[PDB]
Amino acid sequence: GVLKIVKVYLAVKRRIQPGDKMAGRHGNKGVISKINPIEDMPYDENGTP
Amino acid sequence: TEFLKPRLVDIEQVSSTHAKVTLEPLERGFGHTLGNALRRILLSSMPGCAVTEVEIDGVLHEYSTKEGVQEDILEILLNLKGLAVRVQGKDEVILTLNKSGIGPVTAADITHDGDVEIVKPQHVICHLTDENASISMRIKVQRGRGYVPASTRIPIGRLLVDACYSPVERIAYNVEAARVEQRTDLDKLVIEMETNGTIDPEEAIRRAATILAEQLEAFVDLRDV
């Protein structure tokens, strides 16, 4: 029945947003609340957040 | 009653990459206050010169691969995102990188137009495996602020890269005592910072003072209801 079939490949680069899900290596399930500024985060004495 | 005003008593370029500075005199409480304020602003919103657009003649779309270059196009773009530039007068400019032959490819090969200044010539973009395979590419870079991804602002050959308008990465501050000065409880504030090298410490801190002041001008501007 078909005379010709055409497929097309679309790339999408999805980075991150609130609600996405990630975890480590202990079953530590976790969704992400809110991407937040570097400046709101805590940091050590040497300043690295 | 009075409140002695500090001065930028010291700037020192400890390394070609970065520096440290000092403010003196400061009195009790103001130390951590101004420390957090300055760190927050000096991390939050500064000028930038992040690369904006990249064109390559042989490239149709990003996710292809050119012959004679070992790494992916995307990896090359990420290396470019690792680039840092300095410009003085023009908000925008186009940089031109043309080179062929086997060997590494760092920023040193880009055209060296006057205001355009490379801060990290040693920053490698890629490597080339072919004696005759010329990467020839145009780089639109303009100023900006903060972080502008491609999806926000949004030609087929013109490939878009997210912006990273930030010249600094690490900031910290320390309070300490000053000399006797005929008056104790005087506080020296030492501010340590790490930058790619595209921003002078004095320029950054002066801009921080200006921006925070005009924010406080709103507190000065408090009127009516």
PDB file of C-alpha atoms in Angstrom:
ATOM      1  CA  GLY A   1       0.000   0.000   0.000  1.00  0.00           C
ATOM      2  CA  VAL A   2       2.764   2.455   0.880  1.00  0.00           C
ATOM      3  CA  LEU A   3       4.657   4.105  -1.970  1.00  0.00           C
ATOM      4  CA  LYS A   4       7.373   5.651   0.200  1.00  0.00           C
ATOM      5  CA  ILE A   5       8.127   6.283   3.870  1.00  0.00           C
ATOM      6  CA  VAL A   6      10.129   9.239   5.189  1.00  0.00           C
ATOM      7  CA  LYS A   7      11.587   9.423   8.697  1.00  0.00           C
ATOM      8  CA  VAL A   8      13.034  12.574  10.261  1.00  0.00           C
ATOM      9  CA  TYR A   9      15.281  12.858  13.313  1.00  0.00           C
ATOM     10  CA  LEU A  10      14.880  15.810  15.681  1.00  0.00           C
ATOM     11  CA  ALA A  11      17.451  16.611  18.362  1.00  0.00           C
ATOM     12  CA  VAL A  12      16.405  18.360  21.565  1.00  0.00           C
ATOM     13  CA  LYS A  13      18.946  19.422  24.197  1.00  0.00           C
ATOM     14  CA  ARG A  14      17.072  19.316  27.511  1.00  0.00           C
ATOM     15  CA  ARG A  15      19.173  20.605  30.384  1.00  0.00           C
ATOM     16  CA  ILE A  16      17.298  20.769  33.695  1.00  0.00           C
ATOM     17  CA  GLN A  17      14.277  22.400  35.308  1.00  0.00           C
ATOM     18  CA  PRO A  18      12.298  22.153  38.559  1.00  0.00           C
ATOM     19  CA  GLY A  19      10.455  18.864  38.905  1.00  0.00           C
ATOM     20  CA  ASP A  20      13.114  16.730  37.272  1.00  0.00           C
ATOM     21  CA  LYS A  21      14.202  13.568  39.064  1.00  0.00           C
ATOM     22  CA  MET A  22      17.696  12.482  40.069  1.00  0.00           C
ATOM     23  CA  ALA A  23      19.310  10.269  42.680  1.00  0.00           C
ATOM     24  CA  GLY A  24      22.598   8.811  43.829  1.00  0.00           C
ATOM     25  CA  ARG A  25      23.617   5.231  44.634  1.00  0.00           C
ATOM     26  CA  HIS A  26      21.612   4.467  47.777  1.00  0.00           C
ATOM     27  CA  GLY A  27      18.059   4.502  46.470  1.00  0.00           C
ATOM     28  CA  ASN A  28      17.983   8.152  47.572  1.00  0.00           C
ATOM     29  CA  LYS A  29      15.093   9.162  45.352  1.00  0.00           C
ATOM     30  CA  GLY A  30      14.681  12.868  44.827  1.00  0.00           C
ATOM     31  CA  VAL A  31      12.977  15.402  42.606  1.00  0.00           C
ATOM     32  CA  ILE A  32      14.520  18.873  42.330  1.00  0.00           C
ATOM     33  CA  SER A  33      12.745  21.743  44.072  1.00  0.00           C
ATOM     34  CA  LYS A  34      14.135  24.923  42.551  1.00  0.00           C
ATOM     35  CA  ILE A  35      17.289  25.903  40.720  1.00  0.00           C
ATOM     36  CA  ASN A  36      18.586  28.696  42.927  1.00  0.00           C
ATOM     37  CA  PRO A  37      21.329  31.337  42.845  1.00  0.00           C
ATOM     38  CA  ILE A  38      24.905  30.567  43.745  1.00  0.00           C
ATOM     39  CA  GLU A  39      24.581  33.431  46.197  1.00  0.00           C
ATOM     40  CA  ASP A  40      21.721  31.998  48.245  1.00  0.00           C
ATOM     41  CA  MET A  41      23.633  28.752  48.754  1.00  0.00           C
ATOM     42  CA  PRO A  42      25.838  28.251  51.819  1.00  0.00           C
ATOM     43  CA  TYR A  43      29.600  28.295  51.402  1.00  0.00           C
ATOM     44  CA  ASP A  44      32.608  27.315  53.468  1.00  0.00           C
ATOM     45  CA  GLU A  45      35.130  29.701  54.993  1.00  0.00           C
ATOM     46  CA  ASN A  46      37.153  29.730  51.769  1.00  0.00           C
ATOM     47  CA  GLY A  47      33.957  30.732  49.937  1.00  0.00           C
ATOM     48  CA  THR A  48      33.290  27.712  47.733  1.00  0.00           C
ATOM     49  CA  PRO A  49      29.501  27.132  47.752  1.00  0.00           C
TER      50      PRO A  49
ATOM     51  CA  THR B   1      28.123  58.533  66.901  1.00  0.00           C
ATOM     52  CA  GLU B   2      30.205  58.963  63.761  1.00  0.00           C
ATOM     53  CA  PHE B   3      30.994  56.055  61.425  1.00  0.00           C
ATOM     54  CA  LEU B   4      34.499  56.059  59.950  1.00  0.00           C
ATOM     55  CA  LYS B   5      34.484  55.340  56.228  1.00  0.00           C
ATOM     56  CA  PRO B   6      36.735  52.617  54.759  1.00  0.00           C
ATOM     57  CA  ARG B   7      39.000  53.010  51.757  1.00  0.00           C
ATOM     58  CA  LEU B   8      40.248  50.483  49.234  1.00  0.00           C
ATOM     59  CA  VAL B   9      43.516  50.403  51.148  1.00  0.00           C
ATOM     60  CA  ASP B  10      45.001  47.567  49.081  1.00  0.00           C
ATOM     61  CA  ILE B  11      44.761  45.843  45.730  1.00  0.00           C
ATOM     62  CA  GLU B  12      47.274  43.076  45.037  1.00  0.00           C
ATOM     63  CA  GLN B  13      47.507  40.860  41.947  1.00  0.00           C
ATOM     64  CA  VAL B  14      48.569  37.676  43.721  1.00  0.00           C
ATOM     65  CA  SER B  15      48.303  35.767  40.432  1.00  0.00           C
ATOM     66  CA  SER B  16      47.828  36.774  36.820  1.00  0.00           C
ATOM     67  CA  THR B  17      44.439  35.051  37.086  1.00  0.00           C
ATOM     68  CA  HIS B  18      43.117  36.851  40.172  1.00  0.00           C
ATOM     69  CA  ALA B  19      43.837  39.240  43.026  1.00  0.00           C
ATOM     70  CA  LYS B  20      42.835  40.201  46.555  1.00  0.00           C
ATOM     71  CA  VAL B  21      41.813  43.553  48.012  1.00  0.00           C
ATOM     72  CA  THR B  22      41.373  45.180  51.406  1.00  0.00           C
ATOM     73  CA  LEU B  23      38.981  47.705  52.948  1.00  0.00           C
ATOM     74  CA  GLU B  24      39.913  49.723  56.034  1.00  0.00           C
ATOM     75  CA  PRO B  25      38.758  51.101  58.489  1.00  0.00           C
ATOM     76  CA  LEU B  26      35.509  49.355  59.406  1.00  0.00           C
ATOM     77  CA  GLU B  27      33.708  49.276  62.746  1.00  0.00           C
ATOM     78  CA  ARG B  28      31.863  46.558  64.607  1.00  0.00           C
ATOM     79  CA  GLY B  29      29.110  44.675  62.786  1.00  0.00           C
ATOM     80  CA  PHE B  30      29.773  46.274  59.409  1.00  0.00           C
ATOM     81  CA  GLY B  31      32.333  43.562  58.660  1.00  0.00           C
ATOM     82  CA  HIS B  32      30.103  40.566  57.977  1.00  0.00           C
ATOM     83  CA  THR B  33      27.342  42.869  56.721  1.00  0.00           C
ATOM     84  CA  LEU B  34      29.375  44.382  53.904  1.00  0.00           C
ATOM     85  CA  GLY B  35      31.100  41.037  53.412  1.00  0.00           C
ATOM     86  CA  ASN B  36      27.897  39.207  52.555  1.00  0.00           C
ATOM     87  CA  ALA B  37      26.552  42.171  50.589  1.00  0.00           C
ATOM     88  CA  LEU B  38      29.673  42.517  48.457  1.00  0.00           C
ATOM     89  CA  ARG B  39      30.047  38.767  47.969  1.00  0.00           C
ATOM     90  CA  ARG B  40      26.419  38.424  46.903  1.00  0.00           C
ATOM     91  CA  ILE B  41      26.587  41.288  44.418  1.00  0.00           C
ATOM     92  CA  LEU B  42      30.092  40.437  43.125  1.00  0.00           C
ATOM     93  CA  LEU B  43      28.778  36.936  42.441  1.00  0.00           C
ATOM     94  CA  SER B  44      25.340  37.898  41.140  1.00  0.00           C
ATOM     95  CA  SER B  45      25.424  40.499  38.366  1.00  0.00           C
ATOM     96  CA  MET B  46      28.580  41.723  36.632  1.00  0.00           C
ATOM     97  CA  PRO B  47      29.411  42.646  33.029  1.00  0.00           C
ATOM     98  CA  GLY B  48      30.289  39.822  30.688  1.00  0.00           C
ATOM     99  CA  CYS B  49      31.737  39.020  27.285  1.00  0.00           C
ATOM    100  CA  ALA B  50      30.575  35.429  26.799  1.00  0.00           C
ATOM    101  CA  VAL B  51      30.571  34.069  23.260  1.00  0.00           C
ATOM    102  CA  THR B  52      27.136  34.355  21.661  1.00  0.00           C
ATOM    103  CA  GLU B  53      27.105  32.863  18.145  1.00  0.00           C
ATOM    104  CA  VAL B  54      29.449  30.600  16.187  1.00  0.00           C
ATOM    105  CA  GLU B  55      29.407  30.041  12.423  1.00  0.00           C
ATOM    106  CA  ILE B  56      31.497  27.390  10.668  1.00  0.00           C
ATOM    107  CA  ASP B  57      31.467  27.174   6.882  1.00  0.00           C
ATOM    108  CA  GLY B  58      31.509  23.384   6.619  1.00  0.00           C
ATOM    109  CA  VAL B  59      28.853  22.861   9.308  1.00  0.00           C
ATOM    110  CA  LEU B  60      25.175  22.569   8.442  1.00  0.00           C
ATOM    111  CA  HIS B  61      23.869  21.794  11.941  1.00  0.00           C
ATOM    112  CA  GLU B  62      25.556  21.324  15.290  1.00  0.00           C
ATOM    113  CA  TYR B  63      25.283  17.583  15.860  1.00  0.00           C
ATOM    114  CA  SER B  64      27.174  16.682  12.681  1.00  0.00           C
ATOM    115  CA  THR B  65      30.915  15.973  12.678  1.00  0.00           C
ATOM    116  CA  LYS B  66      33.605  17.463  10.476  1.00  0.00           C
ATOM    117  CA  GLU B  67      36.212  15.232   8.893  1.00  0.00           C
ATOM    118  CA  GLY B  68      39.756  15.624  10.164  1.00  0.00           C
ATOM    119  CA  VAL B  69      38.820  16.815  13.671  1.00  0.00           C
ATOM    120  CA  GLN B  70      38.826  14.186  16.390  1.00  0.00           C
ATOM    121  CA  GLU B  71      36.277  15.671  18.797  1.00  0.00           C
ATOM    122  CA  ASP B  72      32.576  16.331  18.354  1.00  0.00           C
ATOM    123  CA  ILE B  73      31.255  19.698  17.256  1.00  0.00           C
ATOM    124  CA  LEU B  74      29.446  20.007  20.585  1.00  0.00           C
ATOM    125  CA  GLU B  75      32.671  19.387  22.499  1.00  0.00           C
ATOM    126  CA  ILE B  76      34.324  22.112  20.426  1.00  0.00           C
ATOM    127  CA  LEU B  77      31.457  24.449  21.298  1.00  0.00           C
ATOM    128  CA  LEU B  78      31.895  23.644  24.985  1.00  0.00           C
ATOM    129  CA  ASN B  79      35.597  24.431  24.683  1.00  0.00           C
ATOM    130  CA  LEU B  80      34.585  27.744  23.120  1.00  0.00           C
ATOM    131  CA  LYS B  81      32.282  28.296  26.091  1.00  0.00           C
ATOM    132  CA  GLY B  82      35.465  27.868  28.107  1.00  0.00           C
ATOM    133  CA  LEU B  83      36.869  30.892  26.263  1.00  0.00           C
ATOM    134  CA  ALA B  84      37.215  34.334  27.833  1.00  0.00           C
ATOM    135  CA  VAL B  85      37.673  37.631  25.986  1.00  0.00           C
ATOM    136  CA  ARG B  86      38.101  41.322  26.784  1.00  0.00           C
ATOM    137  CA  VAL B  87      36.698  44.225  24.749  1.00  0.00           C
ATOM    138  CA  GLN B  88      36.652  47.929  25.621  1.00  0.00           C
ATOM    139  CA  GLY B  89      34.594  50.091  23.268  1.00  0.00           C
ATOM    140  CA  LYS B  90      32.256  47.939  21.191  1.00  0.00           C
ATOM    141  CA  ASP B  91      29.284  46.104  22.661  1.00  0.00           C
ATOM    142  CA  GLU B  92      29.532  43.420  19.950  1.00  0.00           C
ATOM    143  CA  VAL B  93      32.265  42.071  17.685  1.00  0.00           C
ATOM    144  CA  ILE B  94      32.965  39.172  15.316  1.00  0.00           C
ATOM    145  CA  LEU B  95      36.082  37.072  15.879  1.00  0.00           C
ATOM    146  CA  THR B  96      37.665  35.005  13.117  1.00  0.00           C
ATOM    147  CA  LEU B  97      39.516  31.731  13.694  1.00  0.00           C
ATOM    148  CA  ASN B  98      41.130  30.161  10.626  1.00  0.00           C
ATOM    149  CA  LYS B  99      43.653  27.334  10.785  1.00  0.00           C
ATOM    150  CA  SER B 100      44.498  23.988   9.194  1.00  0.00           C
ATOM    151  CA  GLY B 101      47.193  21.353   9.648  1.00  0.00           C
ATOM    152  CA  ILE B 102      47.841  18.645  12.211  1.00  0.00           C
ATOM    153  CA  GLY B 103      48.190  19.782  15.807  1.00  0.00           C
ATOM    154  CA  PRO B 104      46.372  21.567  18.622  1.00  0.00           C
ATOM    155  CA  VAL B 105      44.092  24.553  18.131  1.00  0.00           C
ATOM    156  CA  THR B 106      44.020  27.201  20.878  1.00  0.00           C
ATOM    157  CA  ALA B 107      42.720  30.763  20.958  1.00  0.00           C
ATOM    158  CA  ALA B 108      46.098  32.107  19.785  1.00  0.00           C
ATOM    159  CA  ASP B 109      45.046  31.564  16.151  1.00  0.00           C
ATOM    160  CA  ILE B 110      42.028  33.899  16.335  1.00  0.00           C
ATOM    161  CA  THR B 111      42.256  37.275  14.627  1.00  0.00           C
ATOM    162  CA  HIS B 112      43.646  39.803  17.113  1.00  0.00           C
ATOM    163  CA  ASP B 113      41.531  42.904  16.387  1.00  0.00           C
ATOM    164  CA  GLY B 114      42.438  45.764  18.699  1.00  0.00           C
ATOM    165  CA  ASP B 115      39.810  45.917  21.436  1.00  0.00           C
ATOM    166  CA  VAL B 116      39.384  42.143  21.156  1.00  0.00           C
ATOM    167  CA  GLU B 117      41.882  40.724  23.650  1.00  0.00           C
ATOM    168  CA  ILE B 118      42.343  37.069  24.570  1.00  0.00           C
ATOM    169  CA  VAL B 119      42.967  36.484  28.273  1.00  0.00           C
ATOM    170  CA  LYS B 120      43.730  32.742  27.869  1.00  0.00           C
ATOM    171  CA  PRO B 121      45.595  32.119  24.596  1.00  0.00           C
ATOM    172  CA  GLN B 122      46.617  28.725  25.982  1.00  0.00           C
ATOM    173  CA  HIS B 123      42.941  27.730  26.144  1.00  0.00           C
ATOM    174  CA  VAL B 124      42.757  24.871  23.652  1.00  0.00           C
ATOM    175  CA  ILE B 125      39.672  24.700  21.470  1.00  0.00           C
ATOM    176  CA  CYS B 126      40.465  21.370  19.821  1.00  0.00           C
ATOM    177  CA  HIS B 127      42.994  19.248  17.940  1.00  0.00           C
ATOM    178  CA  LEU B 128      43.328  18.618  14.204  1.00  0.00           C
ATOM    179  CA  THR B 129      44.344  15.293  12.680  1.00  0.00           C
ATOM    180  CA  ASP B 130      44.625  16.280   8.987  1.00  0.00           C
ATOM    181  CA  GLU B 131      47.350  18.263   7.254  1.00  0.00           C
ATOM    182  CA  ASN B 132      44.676  19.761   4.943  1.00  0.00           C
ATOM    183  CA  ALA B 133      41.475  20.372   6.903  1.00  0.00           C
ATOM    184  CA  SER B 134      40.951  24.040   7.732  1.00  0.00           C
ATOM    185  CA  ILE B 135      38.587  25.046  10.493  1.00  0.00           C
ATOM    186  CA  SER B 136      37.459  28.510   9.397  1.00  0.00           C
ATOM    187  CA  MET B 137      34.870  30.036  11.663  1.00  0.00           C
ATOM    188  CA  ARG B 138      33.328  33.313  12.787  1.00  0.00           C
ATOM    189  CA  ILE B 139      32.515  34.092  16.417  1.00  0.00           C
ATOM    190  CA  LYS B 140      29.979  36.763  17.349  1.00  0.00           C
ATOM    191  CA  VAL B 141      30.607  37.888  20.934  1.00  0.00           C
ATOM    192  CA  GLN B 142      28.744  40.721  22.639  1.00  0.00           C
ATOM    193  CA  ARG B 143      28.345  41.950  26.190  1.00  0.00           C
ATOM    194  CA  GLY B 144      25.563  40.906  28.530  1.00  0.00           C
ATOM    195  CA  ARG B 145      24.719  40.014  32.099  1.00  0.00           C
ATOM    196  CA  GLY B 146      24.108  36.818  34.040  1.00  0.00           C
ATOM    197  CA  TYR B 147      22.975  33.744  32.102  1.00  0.00           C
ATOM    198  CA  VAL B 148      21.107  33.832  28.777  1.00  0.00           C
ATOM    199  CA  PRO B 149      20.272  30.374  27.354  1.00  0.00           C
ATOM    200  CA  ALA B 150      19.398  29.770  23.725  1.00  0.00           C
ATOM    201  CA  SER B 151      15.739  29.007  24.447  1.00  0.00           C
ATOM    202  CA  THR B 152      15.247  32.533  25.818  1.00  0.00           C
ATOM    203  CA  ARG B 153      16.259  34.797  22.936  1.00  0.00           C
ATOM    204  CA  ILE B 154      14.973  32.306  20.354  1.00  0.00           C
ATOM    205  CA  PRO B 155      19.706  31.301   9.338  1.00  0.00           C
ATOM    206  CA  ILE B 156      20.443  27.559   9.318  1.00  0.00           C
ATOM    207  CA  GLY B 157      24.237  27.605   9.402  1.00  0.00           C
ATOM    208  CA  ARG B 158      24.303  29.936  12.414  1.00  0.00           C
ATOM    209  CA  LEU B 159      24.445  27.738  15.521  1.00  0.00           C
ATOM    210  CA  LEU B 160      23.365  29.091  18.898  1.00  0.00           C
ATOM    211  CA  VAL B 161      25.207  28.617  22.199  1.00  0.00           C
ATOM    212  CA  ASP B 162      23.927  29.527  25.648  1.00  0.00           C
ATOM    213  CA  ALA B 163      25.506  32.529  27.349  1.00  0.00           C
ATOM    214  CA  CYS B 164      27.638  32.428  30.504  1.00  0.00           C
ATOM    215  CA  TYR B 165      28.021  36.131  31.258  1.00  0.00           C
ATOM    216  CA  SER B 166      30.166  35.746  34.371  1.00  0.00           C
ATOM    217  CA  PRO B 167      33.903  36.551  34.736  1.00  0.00           C
ATOM    218  CA  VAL B 168      34.305  35.321  38.335  1.00  0.00           C
ATOM    219  CA  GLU B 169      33.794  31.972  40.061  1.00  0.00           C
ATOM    220  CA  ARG B 170      35.132  32.096  43.646  1.00  0.00           C
ATOM    221  CA  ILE B 171      34.682  34.788  46.305  1.00  0.00           C
ATOM    222  CA  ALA B 172      35.395  34.878  50.031  1.00  0.00           C
ATOM    223  CA  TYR B 173      35.879  37.490  52.726  1.00  0.00           C
ATOM    224  CA  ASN B 174      37.556  37.674  56.130  1.00  0.00           C
ATOM    225  CA  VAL B 175      37.215  40.233  58.906  1.00  0.00           C
ATOM    226  CA  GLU B 176      40.099  40.949  61.259  1.00  0.00           C
ATOM    227  CA  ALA B 177      41.481  43.591  63.596  1.00  0.00           C
ATOM    228  CA  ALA B 178      43.434  46.610  62.378  1.00  0.00           C
ATOM    229  CA  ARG B 179      46.373  48.470  63.899  1.00  0.00           C
ATOM    230  CA  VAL B 180      45.970  50.342  67.181  1.00  0.00           C
ATOM    231  CA  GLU B 181      45.384  53.582  65.242  1.00  0.00           C
ATOM    232  CA  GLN B 182      44.716  55.283  68.608  1.00  0.00           C
ATOM    233  CA  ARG B 183      41.376  53.434  68.421  1.00  0.00           C
ATOM    234  CA  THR B 184      40.709  49.719  68.819  1.00  0.00           C
ATOM    235  CA  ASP B 185      37.806  47.680  67.413  1.00  0.00           C
ATOM    236  CA  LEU B 186      38.817  48.882  63.941  1.00  0.00           C
ATOM    237  CA  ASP B 187      38.055  46.187  61.376  1.00  0.00           C
ATOM    238  CA  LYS B 188      40.081  45.284  58.293  1.00  0.00           C
ATOM    239  CA  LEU B 189      38.076  43.446  55.631  1.00  0.00           C
ATOM    240  CA  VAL B 190      40.102  41.275  53.239  1.00  0.00           C
ATOM    241  CA  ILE B 191      38.248  40.179  50.102  1.00  0.00           C
ATOM    242  CA  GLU B 192      39.678  37.347  48.001  1.00  0.00           C
ATOM    243  CA  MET B 193      38.361  36.602  44.521  1.00  0.00           C
ATOM    244  CA  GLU B 194      39.028  34.396  41.503  1.00  0.00           C
ATOM    245  CA  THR B 195      38.428  35.626  37.956  1.00  0.00           C
ATOM    246  CA  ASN B 196      39.313  34.469  34.469  1.00  0.00           C
ATOM    247  CA  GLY B 197      41.281  37.732  34.286  1.00  0.00           C
ATOM    248  CA  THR B 198      38.842  39.686  32.125  1.00  0.00           C
ATOM    249  CA  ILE B 199      37.882  42.113  34.925  1.00  0.00           C
ATOM    250  CA  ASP B 200      40.079  44.319  37.065  1.00  0.00           C
ATOM    251  CA  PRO B 201      39.346  43.966  40.806  1.00  0.00           C
ATOM    252  CA  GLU B 202      38.991  47.727  41.207  1.00  0.00           C
ATOM    253  CA  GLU B 203      36.514  47.905  38.330  1.00  0.00           C
ATOM    254  CA  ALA B 204      34.420  45.078  39.774  1.00  0.00           C
ATOM    255  CA  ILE B 205      34.332  46.460  43.308  1.00  0.00           C
ATOM    256  CA  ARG B 206      33.612  50.009  42.130  1.00  0.00           C
ATOM    257  CA  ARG B 207      30.731  48.734  40.011  1.00  0.00           C
ATOM    258  CA  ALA B 208      29.492  46.780  43.030  1.00  0.00           C
ATOM    259  CA  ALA B 209      29.519  49.965  45.089  1.00  0.00           C
ATOM    260  CA  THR B 210      27.680  51.849  42.342  1.00  0.00           C
ATOM    261  CA  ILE B 211      24.995  49.216  41.792  1.00  0.00           C
ATOM    262  CA  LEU B 212      24.367  48.669  45.493  1.00  0.00           C
ATOM    263  CA  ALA B 213      24.199  52.434  46.021  1.00  0.00           C
ATOM    264  CA  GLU B 214      21.635  52.998  43.282  1.00  0.00           C
ATOM    265  CA  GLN B 215      19.659  50.138  44.801  1.00  0.00           C
ATOM    266  CA  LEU B 216      19.876  52.119  48.035  1.00  0.00           C
ATOM    267  CA  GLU B 217      18.899  55.209  46.053  1.00  0.00           C
ATOM    268  CA  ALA B 218      15.486  53.545  46.042  1.00  0.00           C
ATOM    269  CA  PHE B 219      15.738  53.629  49.827  1.00  0.00           C
ATOM    270  CA  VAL B 220      16.719  57.274  49.396  1.00  0.00           C
ATOM    271  CA  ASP B 221      13.870  57.661  46.885  1.00  0.00           C
ATOM    272  CA  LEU B 222      11.235  56.385  49.344  1.00  0.00           C
ATOM    273  CA  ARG B 223       8.348  58.778  48.774  1.00  0.00           C
ATOM    274  CA  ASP B 224       4.612  58.976  49.449  1.00  0.00           C
ATOM    275  CA  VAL B 225       2.652  55.697  49.799  1.00  0.00           C
TER     276      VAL B 225
END
